[PDB]
Design a protein around this ligand. Structure first.
Ligand SMILES: CC(/C=C/C=C(C)/C=C/C=C(C)/C=C/[C@H](CCC(C)(C)O)C(C)(C)O)=C\C=C\C=C(C)\C=C\C=C(C)\C=C\C=C(C)\C=C\[C@H](CCC(C)(C)O)C(C)(C)O
Ligand SMILES: CC(/C=C/C=C(C)/C=C/C=C(C)/C=C/[C@H](CCC(C)(C)O)C(C)(C)O)=C\C=C\C=C(C)\C=C\C=C(C)\C=C\C=C(C)\C=C\[C@H](CCC(C)(C)O)C(C)(C)O
Ligand SMILES: CC(/C=C/C=C(C)/C=C/C=C(C)/C=C/[C@H](CCC(C)(C)O)C(C)(C)O)=C\C=C\C=C(C)\C=C\C=C(C)\C=C\C=C(C)\C=C\[C@H](CCC(C)(C)O)C(C)(C)O
Ligand SMILES: CC(C)=CCC/C(C)=C/CC/C(C)=C/CC/C=C(\C)CC/C=C(\C)CCC=C(C)C
Ligand SMILES: CC(C)=CCC/C(C)=C/CC/C(C)=C/CC/C=C(\C)CC/C=C(\C)CCC=C(C)C
Ligand SMILES: CC(C)=CCC/C(C)=C/CC/C(C)=C/CC/C=C(\C)CC/C=C(\C)CCC=C(C)C
Ligand SMILES: CCCCCCCCCO[C@@H]1O[C@H](CO)[C@@H](O)[C@H](O)[C@H]1O
Ligand SMILES: CCCCCCCCCO[C@@H]1O[C@H](CO)[C@@H](O)[C@H](O)[C@H]1O
Ligand SMILES: CCCCCCCCCO[C@@H]1O[C@H](CO)[C@@H](O)[C@H](O)[C@H]1O
Ligand SMILES: CCCCCCCCCO[C@@H]1O[C@H](CO)[C@@H](O)[C@H](O)[C@H]1O
Ligand SMILES: CCCCCCCCCO[C@@H]1O[C@H](CO)[C@@H](O)[C@H](O)[C@H]1O
Ligand SMILES: CCCCCCCCCO[C@@H]1O[C@H](CO)[C@@H](O)[C@H](O)[C@H]1O
Ligand SMILES: *C/C=C(C)/C=C/C=C(C)/C=C/C1=C(C)CCCC1(C)C
Ligand SMILES: *C/C=C(C)/C=C/C=C(C)/C=C/C1=C(C)CCCC1(C)C
Ligand SMILES: *C/C=C(C)/C=C/C=C(C)/C=C/C1=C(C)CCCC1(C)C
Lengths: 238, 238, 238
């Protein structure tokens, strides 16, 4: 590590604040749910925001930062982003999976692709060459496309077998994931990590802040909005 | 790393020895169990002690040590403790979960809180500021309280629906966890990691040695004491 | 890190190429399988080769390398091997487990031993003393023997309760694992990591290349060879 933060810390704190607020919202919002199913959604969702909050606090306090050397240039890498995504992105897919009524093979595929995506993603963040970093960015992006392919394909088909409100709910959440998630690689390739520095680290941090907040608190908020629709994921009594 | 051990190694070896001995005890003690349930308890428990043993051996041989710089002072951090707890603590909760007859949402919550606890715990161990380290210690301690809240609440309620001997067994094990686990953060805050050095590293190592041994070998010994009571966790035939 | 590759890179590329080719083979080979079971085998298997491919590409580009100091000598460690095995070896056992018709306790034991094996294995790769490295090599090898003991024992017994073609298929795959897996520790102890340098890093890289390819692409190829036999792992309709 041994890297100082910078003016971007403003976004890091807003992010930390937002994630912490979403968590408390979901904790109180989840208060009183007895249905074992509705609860899953609250647990998964709540863990997504608190993890994100802790990592944002890590980058804010300067813990989740480091300096990576690449071609007579020292890039500033906020690695905590990966420790965050490594856990939160698969959970988000879990949410979608459970929402769509998908089976373990599909959900396992999604999780597997996702982890491969963040893993090759952090390799890219630390690679020692503009060529190597972009190669890895390329591997990781490929995986993103492979999992998005599962979302619009098999997963979408599963959701169509769900009650209409659930299917609708899925559609929204799926489309949110598609637009938001595709933006991450773009912000990365343009930002500091891509070695091209087209998008200043200050604005890159902000971009990731808006994305993370929308992909987690926003996502969670529309997911857990209605309790009755969410319990249509299952019909029988228990 | 690049840090030398010290006089505390005596405790590290005792610890290594104890954990290795508990393992062999459980391996031989588990010999002959056919009931698929009783076995779970033996597998989980046995993995707890061998993991602990390997990590204790790691700290003993000097592998699991490092030097962390914080405020013109170089703290000695035994990070292997975290690699240990990261795996053993969730397993211990698995044991309690299975013992109480808890459902996946409760057990998943416990595991999730626990991992968050050790994760923020090791961040704290490496933070670069007395203020940051204590902040993280604070986050981690909060999580400890959140999971303890689940133990005395929901988990205790589940156990009351179990056969009386199992409920009794739970009570003991739960109370053991509560008293022992609360002591870890105290030993940490007072020891070297807390930056206050109130409790010498030599005695801190001993304290953690007694705790780990009691929280694993002791715990295991009272858990796997009786085979008949343990099989009351399930009633039907198989 | 900060370590340069070397003439061994030739094997690393062949390896990268082979793993990538096996993956595409399995992806296309898995095209059209609807049976939820047959699919598991394809997903698990496919993830094994792509993980291996990415790690081989990591070592090829020099990312997965580092220099470890031990006794006035600086060893060259290809750590990516461990990040690879940490995920692929447990998956391979999953394949065998599912093939044998084993229960979760057996499969969990296998996975647990396996992870302990690679974990102590990478510790050994980084230990600071010929004596410590070999001690860990010793711990890890012990675990290898413990899991091999489960393969020829309980796992083999489970497979005998399977349809004959499945039992046969198991036998092959089990024997392949036994001969191939036992060779890893030998190649390690003789290679650079063992501190004895009996087997040059150049040939060590090749040896591991042949093993990895045989233990994954070979293994996969004989596993997924026949679709009908693989669906005999389950009989009823779904
Ligand atoms: C560190 C810290 C706080 C940590 C708290 C966290 C991460 C909160 C987790 C919340 C969850 C997942 C709750 C699930 C409930 C289930 C509760 C249960 C029944 C299992 O007790 C539910 C579904 C809403 O009802 C503060 C300082
Ligand atoms: C490295 C080394 C030793 C490693 C050994 C380990 C970590 C032991 C694990 C033991 C377990 C979890 C046993 C489970 C049995 C189940 C056995 C089975 C049926 C699955 O074969 C059971 C329940 C008691 O019966 C030595 C040097
Ligand atoms: C990064 C990159 C490529 C990444 C691709 C990977 C790792 C492939 C994974 C494939 C799997 C596990 C497929 C499972 C299918 C199931 C598909 C499903 C129904 C879930 O859509 C099945 C069983 C064959 O049919 C390229 C650049
Ligand atoms: C249906 C069923 C029973 C099973 C289905 C199959 C599953 C669940 C497969 C999962 C596969 C998975 C999660 C693969 C993950 C691969 C990720 C990596 C190899 C990551 C490597 C990261 C690094 C090497 C980071 C380096 C950092 C520094 C500072 C050097
Ligand atoms: C009921 C159901 C189907 C699912 C329920 C939900 C579950 C199981 C959620 C689990 C969540 C979980 C395990 C979160 C873990 C978070 C831990 C971290 C972010 C740890 C980070 C650690 C570091 C960053 C260490 C740094 C070390 C150095 C030397 C710099
Ligand atoms: C049947 C049922 C419900 C549960 C059964 C029990 C199970 C599944 C137990 C699993 C146990 C497990 C996976 C233990 C793993 C232990 C591995 C470690 C402690 C690894 C440590 C690695 C390091 C410390 C690497 C250091 C690297 C550097 C550069 C310093
Ligand atoms: C940087 C600040 C971040 C704050 C994050 C808190 C998110 C909670 C806001 O959710 C809103 O709660 C209302 C309850 O009255 C619902 O009616 C409405 O539909 C829902 O969208
Ligand atoms: C790392 C791998 C993690 C995989 C986690 C998968 C969660 C499995 C729970 O999903 C369930 O799967 C069944 C398959 O039969 C469906 O019928 C059911 O409707 C669906 O709710
Ligand atoms: C530093 C040394 C650590 C040694 C750890 C070994 C623990 C095994 C001792 O357990 C005891 O085994 C007896 C069997 O005769 C039981 O009757 C008794 O109830 C039980 O408590
Ligand atoms: C990282 C997440 C790990 C979660 C592991 C949870 C283990 C699930 C096994 O427990 C079982 O759950 C059922 C819920 O219906 C109960 O009815 C049953 O009595 C209980 O034995
Ligand atoms: C370095 C190059 C690595 C190439 C790896 C590709 C492996 C695919 C070869 O498998 C073979 O496919 C045939 C299909 O016609 C089967 O009939 C035959 O039984 C099977 O063994
Ligand atoms: C980290 C731990 C991972 C453990 C993964 C275990 C996968 C469990 C699926 O296996 C199933 O177990 C049943 C036990 O009752 C058998 O009856 C059934 O035939 C078998 O297919
Ligand atoms: C809460 C956080 C979320 C939903 C994060 C999502 C991140 C991604 C989809 C990231 C993708 C990336 C690539 C495809 C290429 C390389 C770099 C990454 C990691 C930015
Ligand atoms: C076998 C080991 C066990 C049961 C270890 C348990 C450890 C804890 C409950 C640790 C808790 C901590 C905090 C609450 C605050 C920060 C530091 C820790 C990790 C010591
Ligand atoms: C695809 C890769 C496979 C199947 C790799 C298997 C590796 C092993 C069985 C390794 C075993 C080792 C020991 C027993 C001792 C110490 C060092 C290792 C990691 C080489």
């Amino acid at each position: 590590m041994a890297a100082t933060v910078g003016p971007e810390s403003i976004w890091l704190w807003i992010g930390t604040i937002g994630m912490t607020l979403g968590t408390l919202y979901f904790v109180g919002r989840g208060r009183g749910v007895r249905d074992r199913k509705m609860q899953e959604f609250y647990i998964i969702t709540t863990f997504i925001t608190t993890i994100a909050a802790a990592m944002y606090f890590a980058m804010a306090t300067g813990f989740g930062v480091t300096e990576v050397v690449v071609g007579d240039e020292a890039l500033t890498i906020y690695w905590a982003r990966y420790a965050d995504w490594l856990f939160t992105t698969p959970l988000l897919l879990l949410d979608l999976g459970l929402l769509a009524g998908a089976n373990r093979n599909t959900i396992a595929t999604l999780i597997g692709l996702d982890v491969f995506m963040i893993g090759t993603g952090m390799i890219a963040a630390f690679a020692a060459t503009p060529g190597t970093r972009i190669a890895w960015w390329g591997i990781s992006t490929g995986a993103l496309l492979a999992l998005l392919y599962v979302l619009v394909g098999t997963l979408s088909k599963d959701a169509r077998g769900q009650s209409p409100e659930v299917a609708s709910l899925f559609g929204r959440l799926r489309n949110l994931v598609i637009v938001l998630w595709l933006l991450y690689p773009v912000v990365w390739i343009l930002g500091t990590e891509g070695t091209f520095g087209i998008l200043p680290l200050y604005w890159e941090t902000a971009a990731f802040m808006v994305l993370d907040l929308s992909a987690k608190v926003g996502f969670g908020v529309v997911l857990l909005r209605s309790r009755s629709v969410l319990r249509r994921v299952v019909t029988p009594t228990a």
